[PDB]
């Protein structure tokens, strides 16, 4: 099994884009956290199977909400965490 870290920029907020991505996390039973960086990006990190993690990357990258991405970066690992929920930093 796998993990990602993702960073995104664009209109990547508005009222709850960070909530939206964690809905899409739960929808594919990923488990991890979401944050808004002081540098202005949103950042996401979660464990899951490869197909779930990549389908989630498409869900962020597509900018399906009113909030949408215009730049994305992704890193991937095998470093499972034992995460069993989604979490939202109060950034």
UniProtKB/Swiss-Prot annotation:
Active site, UniProt feature: 18, 36
InterPro entries in UniProt: Acylphosphatase, Acylphosphatase-like_dom, Acylphosphatase-like_dom_sf, Acylphosphatase_CS
Pfam short name (any one): Acylphosphatase
Enzyme Commission numbers on file: 3.6.1.7
Signal sequence, start to end: none
UniProt superkingdom: Bacteria
pH dependence: Optimum pH is 5.3.
Domain spans labelled Acylphosphatase-like: 3-90
SUPFAM superfamilies noted in UniProt: Acylphosphatase/BLUF domain-like (SSF54975)
Entry keyword Ribosomal protein: no
Catalytic activity annotation: an acyl phosphate + H2O = a carboxylate + phosphate + H(+)
Gene Ontology terms, MF aspect: acylphosphatase activity
Keywords: Hydrolase
Family that this chain belongs to: Belongs to the acylphosphatase family.
Protein name per the record: Acylphosphatase
Organism, scientific name: Bacillus subtilis (strain 168)
Name of encoding gene: acyP
């Amino acid at each position: 099994m796998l993990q990602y870290r993702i960073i995104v920029d664009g209109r990547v907020q508005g009222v709850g884009f960070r909530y939206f991505v964690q809905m899409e996390a739960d929808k594919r039973k990923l488990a991890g956290w979401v944050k808004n960086r002081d540098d202005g990006r949103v950042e996401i990190l979660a464990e899951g199977p490869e197909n779930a993690l990549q389908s989630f990357v498409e869900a962020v990258k597509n900018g399906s909400p009113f909030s949408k991405v215009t730049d994305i970066s992704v890193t991937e690992s095998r470093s499972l965490e034992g995460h069993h929920r989604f979490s939202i930093v109060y950034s």
